[PDB]
Amino acid sequence: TISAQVIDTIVEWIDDNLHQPLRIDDIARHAGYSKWHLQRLFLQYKGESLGRYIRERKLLLAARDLRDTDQRVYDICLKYGFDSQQTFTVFTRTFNQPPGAYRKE
DNA sequence: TCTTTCTATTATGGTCATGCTATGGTACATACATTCACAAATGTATGTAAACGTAACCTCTGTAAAGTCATTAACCTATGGCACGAAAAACCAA
């Protein structure tokens, strides 16, 4: 029990939520835990900054949609959180693996 | 040895219930005691005082437990400072 069961709710919010980005103000509210209700968790349970963990989660989620043989490549990053194609093109810094070649795999 | 013509007790119901009640007389004289009904006195009786004790009973000071508020410092919004991870510019390979 950390901050009255915030771990059991963060995962549910990440699962249920739409492609809306996750920031301090966005998740600070209906979360039931403010900035410090999340800082301790991100420091202890995860040990990684939000901008990298969210990007990794989006990449792991899109790894299946890229294999689902979808022709609308521009909408793949949009349906998962990346509001722009250039920002998602994160993939170069993470995998150094072609968008298209991976999409071909 | 046996069936008719006489001499005497049982029997047939109560339910719905009725008024107004007696009917003739036929001797006294002594007698002695049981019983009812009142005088008057006893005896236990009832109702009026007076003494002790606690049914107590409020009053007040001390012991005790319960709400609250002096400390003091634990954490917690702030402030400043330094990594950190994203986003765009740049340049190289094909």
Strand B within 7 A of A51 CB: yes
Helix (H, G, I), strand (E, B) or coil at A105: coil
Q: Tokens standing for A56?
A: 């990794």
Enter the DSSP assignment of A16.
Answer: H
Query: Distance between CA atoms of A11 and A93, rounded to whole angstroms?
Result: 26
Q: Give first-to-last CA distance, chain A, whole Å.
A: 42
C-alpha Rg value of chain A to the nearest Å = 15
Tokens for A93, please give them: 């810094």
Residues preceding chain discontinuities in chain A with C to N over 2.5 Å: 89
Gap between the Cα atoms of A10 and A33, Å rounded: 10
Measured CA to C1', what is the nucleotide nearest A52? B85
Pick from A55, A54, A28, A26: nearest CA to A39: A28
Q: A29-41 burial string, b = 16+ CB within 10 Å, else e?
A: eeeebeeebbeeb
Per the entry, the structure determination technique was cryo-EM
How long is chain A?
Answer: 105
Sign of CA dihedral A98, A75, A22, A16: negative
- A82 closest CA partner among A51, A105, A103: A51
| CB of A90 closer than 8 Å to CB of A81 | no
Helix, strand, or coil here: A48?
A: coil
Distance A79 CA to B85 C1' (A): 23
At A67, the amino acid letter reads: R
